[PDB]
């Protein structure tokens, strides 16, 4: 589907109504599987971190580690299809310009590729941007073939503010997710019992990001 039909007929109205929007079959099986292959090669050649320290045991051989990450620009060798994914995310956001809230999105982060190793670890409940750092939209792409949450867990559970219910999103192959990054969407990753990959990009609102630079004042200018 053109980034445009999807953006204008589904993503824009969904984000303004619900703030949480799922697109399945974003890139297709061939491109999705190539991204999966690039991510697995990154993992298998040791490009990820060792994982979030979960239990700091007295003996370190007993330390439990969780989600592993790596930051990907998209131009690295063997990340070209990841870069294609990122360009496709950018195309979608660009076709939403001036329709996502009142936000104006001119910049994003690099991609954070995450691997939950499948050892029962998840990710605690949190808000992506609780303190106004500029991030207004969180975009996650999943690449887990035939994921069965009843068996492997790993559901993303979101707790939409003001609503007495949560929204459970399975980390399905070739699924793209958008949600507001601020306190509207506290969320958690339930324990994952199989290897679980995701690629996240955050989009900045230009105003919020510009004034965030005041708080984090960071390179300066010489006086004398
Ligand atoms: O993977 C998912 O479905 C959702 N993941 C996250 O919400 C998530 N959020 C943050 Cl802020 C981090 C931050 C660092 C590493 C992994 C993260 C993560 O998986
Ligand atoms: Mn998060």
Residue numbers in the entry: 188 to 404, 407 to 413
What does the paper say about this structure?
The ferrous iron and 2-oxoglutarate (2OG)-dependent HIF prolyl hydroxylases (PHDs/EGLNs) catalyse trans-4-prolyl hydroxylations on HIFα subunits, thus promoting their binding to the von Hippel–Lindau protein (VHL), a targeting component of a ubiquitin E3 ligase, and signalling for HIFα degradation under normoxic conditions. The PHD-catalysed hydroxylations of HIF-1α/HIF-2α in higher animals occur in amino- and carboxy-terminal oxygen-dependent degradation domains (NODD and CODD). The three human PHDs exhibit different NODD/CODD selectivities, with PHD3 being substantially more selective for CODD than PHD1/2 (refs 16). Biophysical analyses employing crystallography and NMR reveal that the molecular basis of PHD isoform and variant selectivity involves enzyme–substrate interactions involving β2/β3 loop residues (that bind the LXXLAP motif) and helices α3 and α4, regions which display sequence variations between the PHD isoforms.
Using biochemical and structural studies, we identified four more residues in α3 and α3-βI loop regions (PHD2/Ile280, Arg281, Ile292 and Gly294 that are substituted in PHD3/Val102, Leu103, Val114 and Glu116, respectively) and which play roles in determining selectivity. Indeed, we found that FG2216 (IOX3)35, used in clinical trials for treatment of anaemia, preferentially displaces NODD over CODD from PHD2.
